Amino acid sequence: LRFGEMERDCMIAHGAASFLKERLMEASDAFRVHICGICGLMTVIAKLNHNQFECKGCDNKIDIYQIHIPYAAKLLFQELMAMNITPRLYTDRSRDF
Amino acid sequence: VSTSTFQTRRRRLKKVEEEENAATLQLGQEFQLKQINHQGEEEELIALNLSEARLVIKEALVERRRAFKRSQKKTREKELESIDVLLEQTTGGNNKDLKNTMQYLTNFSRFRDQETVGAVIQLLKSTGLHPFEVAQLGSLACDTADEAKTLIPSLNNKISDDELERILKELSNLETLY
Amino acid sequence: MFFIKDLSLNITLHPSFFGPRMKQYLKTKLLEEVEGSCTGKFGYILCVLDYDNIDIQRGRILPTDGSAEFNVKYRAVVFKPFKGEVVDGTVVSCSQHGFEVQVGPMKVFVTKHLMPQDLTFNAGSNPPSYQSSEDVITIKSRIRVKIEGCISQVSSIHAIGSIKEDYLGAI
Amino acid sequence: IFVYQNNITPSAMKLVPSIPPATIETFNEAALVVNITHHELVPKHIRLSSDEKRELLKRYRLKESQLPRIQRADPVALYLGLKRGEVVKIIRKSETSGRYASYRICM
Amino acid sequence: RLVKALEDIMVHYDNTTRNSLGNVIQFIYGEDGMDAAHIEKQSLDTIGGSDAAFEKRYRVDLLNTDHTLDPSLLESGSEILGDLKLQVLLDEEYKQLVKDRKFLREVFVDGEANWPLPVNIRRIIQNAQQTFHIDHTKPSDLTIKDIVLGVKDLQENLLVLRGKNEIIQNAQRDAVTLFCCLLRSRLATRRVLQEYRLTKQAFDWVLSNIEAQFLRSVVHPGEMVGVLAAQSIGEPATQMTLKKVTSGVPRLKEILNVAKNMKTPSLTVY
Amino acid sequence: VGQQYSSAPLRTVKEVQFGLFSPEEVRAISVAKIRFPETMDETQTRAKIGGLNDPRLGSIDRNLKCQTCQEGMNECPGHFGHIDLAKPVFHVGFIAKIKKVCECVCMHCGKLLLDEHNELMRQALAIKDSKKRFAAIWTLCKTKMVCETDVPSEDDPTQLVSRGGCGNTQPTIRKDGLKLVGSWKKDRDEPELRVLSTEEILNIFKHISVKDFTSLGFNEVFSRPEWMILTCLPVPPPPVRPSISFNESQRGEDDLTFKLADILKANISLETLEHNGAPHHAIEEAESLLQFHVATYMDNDIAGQPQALQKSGRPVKSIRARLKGKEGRIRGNLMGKRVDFSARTVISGDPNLELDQVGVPKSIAKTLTYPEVVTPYNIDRLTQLVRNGPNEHPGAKYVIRDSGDRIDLRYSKRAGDIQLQYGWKVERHIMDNDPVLFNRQPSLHKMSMMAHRVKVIPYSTFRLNLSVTSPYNADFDGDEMNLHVPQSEETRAELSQLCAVPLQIVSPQSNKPCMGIVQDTLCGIRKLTLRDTFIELDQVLNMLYWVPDWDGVI
Amino acid sequence: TLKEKAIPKDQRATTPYMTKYERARILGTRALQISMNAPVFVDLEGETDPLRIAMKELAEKKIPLVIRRYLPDGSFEDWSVEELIVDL
Amino acid sequence: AGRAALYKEVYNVIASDGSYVNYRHMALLVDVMTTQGGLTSVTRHGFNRSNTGALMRCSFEETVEILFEAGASAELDDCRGVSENVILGQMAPIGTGAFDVMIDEESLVKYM
RNA sequence: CGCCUGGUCA
RNA sequence: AGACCAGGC
Ligand SMILES: [Mg+2]
Ligand SMILES: [Zn+2]
Ligand SMILES: [Zn+2]
Ligand SMILES: [Zn+2]
């Protein structure tokens, strides 16, 4: 079935934080990618076996993370990149406020 | 899950300037003379010269075996065996590194008294010298200001040869026996 | 050269262990994962000091599973050699391409051609060795090397050093 | 303050912001015939000392930009002669609770 | 649109209505920090009624044979008559109830006295009644010092904001203001003893409740009022099945758009 | 989720840095040249040529390989490749700015056209807001068409001060198709019109000042004007434009996989004309083609008509179309999705269910599941539901042990066997009193969605209590409704504690209750009331019995 | 900044009573954990449902949790289930 | 005085149906429209242009168009917007998620 | 509006 | 997987 826009807005109203997330992630997309702690990209070449991770270009192997996002968004991002735009994924805030 | 370090360097993309590591007293950014304490304060780098290290380890490795029993209710070749024990009791045992750091540390050490190592430090800290030298001087036997200023090229112009030679003398004087 | 650096690690604890002696379990896992580790940014982590006052702070509970995550701030004794650093250790292995000295938790190797010429290599020796006019280096022989370059690797650090300068050789 | 009748020449007005600190304001007759502030709908405003303002912020933990704004040309804003950065406190009645205290910074 | 335009607005832990930037949109949710679900149309008695009647109800004059509380009401009735020190609190009470009158006649010019307000008092008393089987016969046992001094004391505890300072604490008095009028409106001495013959017990309970019942009506820092507000309007806009102006639905579309050329421009001048 | 453990630490995205790709970076990242335009067939031989899709990049055929990166299809995101263009091309969307920027700087030297010197300029240089500066700065110097080398400073209009030099007249500019042209005025007369080669534009921007970038809403690290023009082109991996195999000896490539095929072709042809018989201005009759395809690939719904239809008259989804509002990625994939653990049927009223309940048909109750963790508090109950199988009602249909492996109860040669292990999870059936979220679209209330107590029943309908009718705004004339089943012990919580129907009784959208009594119950409650109406013992006793909370005091 | 972002147990200003969202989430979180096989701090009076047990731990305020309340500017205030008044 | 009118008028639209809405809602909206400075419309033209994050305004009417000038001006999104998280698959700071929960190891001992 | 079932198109 | 048409409240 479909948990569309309107349905979301209600859950948001109810302030049903977690459940809303659950509907979106665990109950649908939910994908696990790797990022470069340097350039906010999916570049990373995680071999999740011999624990190698690398990221030639920004050249890494040490500063790497793992995040859960909707495969719809992995796609949204790659799609934006293919249009030469860079959606950086950073795991820590720096601009304060 | 590795282990970060007290300092959020805003790595804004361009990660290209990884300087070299030489006795130009240029150690990784991770070891500037100016690092930060947990409390948030600044603090001089911390350089341990052999033996002085052997004590810092042994001392914590000991006060560990102790707090490991508070909750348990609910001479050269001689110290080799004595420490092996302190290991198979408060170590991971599979830390083949510490075994080796303790034999090495306990073999090439240059002092046996927390008194001696204390005087050694009192003395050397009056030079205003950098901690990495202040360490190298304590763990490396030196007879000439040349043997010194040569194996520790970061010195060279930071102290007259006579000066550094006096200090060197006092070192062989304090240098515990066997 | 040996250092005492202030570090901090993050551990994710399963609700299972959310008992009474948790602080206890945390610390223990800290050690299992840190003591004996190895980076290029910290080199060899060897011993966690002040076991007693290790700071756990308050850990927070993740939000899908109950696992909580604490940022365990500690302090310990580290050691990462450098290029141009002078250290002396015992020789362990020794072949036709050189001998390999061991300084602490690390092994520094010296090329047959990074020594002096008047020092050749003797094959039919037991144990294998390197002879000279008045010097003879083999197994237990205590050397003093100058670390020329360092190559960080896996959970270890190797480096090549020379003994072709002055005040560098045996003792 | 200067009160023009039908208007001022575009050659005249470009001479006001030429003698700081002192400032000048232009007002039209037909515009001041009635006092807007006296309108059923217009609640009363109030200026705030660069202290009272530096307090309003500190008390609400607000950065200047998160504050409700009022037009530099806003009818009332002129009436009191605000200045880019000045803050006004608007106090009006309320069908939920007697009165409501609200602030307006000027852009 | 309404929704997408308010998603991010929620009441923060300081009791402020802000969005994702942190910009204040309302300093106190709804100009009263009350959660809509805890509100009923109460009536502010103090507003209506002739100037005459008013006095006949809230006026107590311990210094008069015909304007004093007949001891058939108060236990300490007769031994109160003439006491000047009381008559000051008593007059203080009255001067207040009158300031209220004028104030309300300023906010609500219509004369309309029925408004949405937290803590239904008319009922909070009705229970007080039969919960202590209070008999309209025998006299009370409240000191006049009891009533007026606990009533003023109650207000001190109807907390919306907590702030440890002047700016904040002053907003408090604002957020409450209206409520209190209603509060004093129903806890006026005369009223308290003649209209609803409470006792010491009765009163203390009625008080105890109002306080807690109030504290419940406050809005929970967490409320996603942006979407709430949006939906609450948009919804009844779908239920719209349809003197000569611009009507509703097309009119609202007009409004939200902030359109220059509206079908009906009109303008009423008095 | 995403399966298989990783020594990688995991955090949550706290910020999003939007930038532009530096042709260099594009190269750094890429894991494949992409020289050929074809798909595979190593000369009919199936596989993939080191040309397009998988010159090392992602894969197909269910074969680990992904540059050793193994994993295969599910786990391995895509691995961007690149493609060195023949000549710089614009960026279908940036054209707006690329142009609006040139009108802001002067060619030849490349620098602002209004310095601190011009006063009306200072004001535009204080407005801390890239969107607004650049929108002011541009309205200022979009008019002045002469690169002034000397201007009247903060003193006498008599004394002329100097700065940058080369007054080279500035040409007004206009947009025609995907190319920018401008006319230069000469006095003495008549204009001078020429096409502004990308190769040139690109350059002037390259030279534009570091502090000039910034003054004009830009960014030294992330988005430098010189990047709005494509030198190198990122090639999205298979997963973005997956194939589709009708078994074997059949293709199935995606729309995009073709436009690259196009762009690539159109590129090679160019290059081959520039290291060969290059009829100078007969090349720019094909360089525009690359400008075309590489514009189309990203946007295909432009103003200069040419829709670039795919042989068949079919439009061709531009990447942009894939995201465009509603039904598209952002609005129809991320802001809303399809979900598992959800059912729908026809609703009917049942005057015998407490308000908060919801009659669920056994059919569904046996379909919908709930991951319960084997705990000493239910180890028993659970082993029973497991023995009960996926067919009898109170039962379950899947057991999962810590070793991330699914046991399919309905087939497994061990269904009857199996002793659960604490910590394992048993996906069991929805049972009586499993808090669920119910709802009737269109959803415009908090209330169009509420939490009910599952009450499994026969027959195929969602039997809901009556009074909870108007909050959903439903009738029974063939009305359908949706049921969503929570999943984590905390999820339920959020439903039972804030979404329960009892909680929604008083609606804040009008500070008054939102559910009442309708039809029969209402109509009847009036009649029953009336003074005129009296009831005798034999029945009065029955009526008593029915109120479940009768204290037994006739 | 940190610790500069944490308001002292004194000077505390948020609400004394637990928000509905908090309690809702504490019960959920605690439930999830109890179901996770975590230690239960109350006598299970026979109870066997986590959220049932959670409701109990929460009624004898024996829930080892702390609610960190963020303010619009980043600073926060820490409260414990133990403290917080549970009216609702 | 304008907010006053804007409100007054909006109320008249809902009142003309014989319906009832609690001040607050219409007020909040009337306010959202006013604060900023003048009369900010609830349209792709007004409100959806404010400083709000990109990804947020991204989910409404100008999607790609907005995303483009978003990397062209190297914007930064706080991830404070509800939408933001919804798109990332994270728990948005909303009711249940407007705070954090921690195991106070201290009290976790006094309990036994 | 949104949601669902068609199938139909080949 | 999509574009059209039929239907449903
Ligand atoms: Mg119907
Ligand atoms: Zn990288
Ligand atoms: Zn791969
Ligand atoms: Zn020029």
Curated annotation (Swiss-Prot), chain B:
SUPFAM superfamilies: HRDC-like (SSF47819). GO terms for cellular component: cytoplasm; nucleus; P-body; RNA polymerase II, core complex; RPB4-RPB7 complex. Residues 1-21 are annotated as: Disordered. GO terms for molecular function: nucleotide binding; translation initiation factor binding. Its main location: nucleus. It is found in: Nucleus; Cytoplasm; Cytoplasm, P-body. Keywords: Acetylation, Cytoplasm, DNA-directed RNA polymerase, mRNA processing, Nucleus, Phosphoprotein, Transcription. GO terms for biological process: DNA-templated transcription initiation; mRNA processing; nuclear-transcribed mRNA catabolic process, deadenylation-dependent decay; positive regulation of translational initiation; RNA-templated transcription; transcription by RNA polymerase II; transcription elongation by RNA polymerase II; transcription initiation at RNA polymerase II promoter. It holds the Pfam family RNA_pol_Rpb4. InterPro entries: HRDC-like_sf (IPR010997), RNA_pol_Rpb4/RPC9_core (IPR006590), Rpb4-like (IPR045222), Rpb4/RPC9 (IPR005574), Rpb4/RPC9_sf (IPR038324). Belongs to the eukaryotic RPB4 RNA polymerase subunit family. PANTHER family: DNA-DIRECTED RNA POLYMERASE II. This is DNA-directed RNA polymerase II subunit RPB4. The gene is RPB4.
Swiss-Prot record, chain C:
Pfam families: S1, SHS2_Rpb7-N. Its main location: nucleus. GO terms for molecular function: single-stranded DNA binding; single-stranded RNA binding; translation initiation factor binding. GO terms for biological process: DNA-templated transcription initiation; nuclear-transcribed mRNA catabolic process; nuclear-transcribed mRNA catabolic process, deadenylation-dependent decay; positive regulation of nuclear-transcribed mRNA poly(A) tail shortening; positive regulation of translational initiation; RNA-templated transcription; transcription by RNA polymerase II; transcription elongation by RNA polymerase II. GO terms for cellular component: cytoplasm; nucleus; P-body; RNA polymerase II, core complex; RPB4-RPB7 complex. It is found in: Nucleus; Cytoplasm; Cytoplasm, P-body. SUPFAM superfamilies: N-terminal, heterodimerisation domain of RBP7 (RpoE) (SSF88798), Nucleic acid-binding proteins (SSF50249). InterPro entries: NA-bd_OB-fold, RNA_pol_Rpb7-like_N_sf, Rpb7-like, Rpb7-like_N, S1_domain. Signal peptide: none annotated. Keywords: Cytoplasm, DNA-directed RNA polymerase, Nucleus, Transcription. Component of the RNA polymerase II (Pol II) complex consisting of 12 subunits. RPB4 and RPB7 form a subcomplex that protrudes from the 10-subunit Pol II core complex. The RPB4-RPB7 subcomplex probably associates with TFG1. Interacts with NRD1 and PAT1. Belongs to the eukaryotic RPB7/RPC8 RNA polymerase subunit family. Present with 6420 molecules/cell in log phase SD medium.
From Swiss-Prot, chain D:
It is found in: Nucleus. Transmembrane segments: none annotated. Component of the RNA polymerase I (Pol I), RNA polymerase II (Pol II) and RNA polymerase III (Pol III) complexes. Component of the RNA polymerase I (Pol I) complex consisting of 14 subunits: RPA135, RPA190, RPC40, RPA14, RPB5, RPO26, RPA43, RPB8, RPA12, RPB10, RPC19, RPC10, RPA49 and RPA34. The complex is composed of a horseshoe-shaped core containing ten subunits (RPA135, RPA190, RPB5, RPO26, RPB8, RPB10, RPC10, RPA12, RPC19 and RPC40) where RPA135 and RPA190 form the DNA-binding cleft. Belongs to the archaeal Rpo5/eukaryotic RPB5 RNA polymerase subunit family. DNA-dependent RNA polymerases catalyze the transcription of DNA into RNA using the four ribonucleoside triphosphates as substrates. Common component of RNA polymerases I, II and III which synthesize ribosomal RNA precursors, mRNA precursors and many functional non-coding RNAs, and small RNAs, such as 5S rRNA and tRNAs, respectively. Pol II is the central component of the basal RNA polymerase II transcription machinery. RNA polymerase complexes are composed of mobile elements that move relative to each other. This is DNA-directed RNA polymerases I, II, and III subunit RPABC1. The gene is RPB5. The chain holds residues 109 to 215 of 215 of the full protein.
Curated annotation (Swiss-Prot), chain H:
The tandem 7 residues repeats in the C-terminal domain (CTD) can be highly phosphorylated. The phosphorylation activates Pol II. Phosphorylation occurs mainly at residues 'Ser-2' and 'Ser-5' of the heptapeptide repeat. The phosphorylated form of Pol II appears to carry, on average, one phosphate per repeat. The phosphorylation state is believed to result from the balanced action of site-specific CTD kinases and phosphatases, and a 'CTD code' that specifies the position of Pol II within the transcription cycle has been proposed. It is found in: Nucleus. There is a cross-link at K8 (Glycyl lysine isopeptide (Lys-Gly) (interchain with G-Cter in ubiquitin)). It comes from the Eukaryota. The C-terminal domain (CTD) serves as a platform for assembly of factors that regulate transcription initiation, elongation, termination and mRNA processing. Belongs to the RNA polymerase beta' chain family. Component of the RNA polymerase II (Pol II) complex consisting of 12 subunits. Interacts with DEF1; the interaction is direct and serves to bridge RPB1 to the Elongin complex in a DNA-damaged dependent manner. Interacts with the Elongin subunit ELA1. Interacts with the Elongin subunit ELC1. Interacts with ASK10. Interacts with ESS1. Interacts with RTT103. Interacts with SHE2. This is DNA-directed RNA polymerase II subunit RPB1. It comes from Saccharomyces cerevisiae (strain ATCC 204508 / S288c) (Baker's yeast).
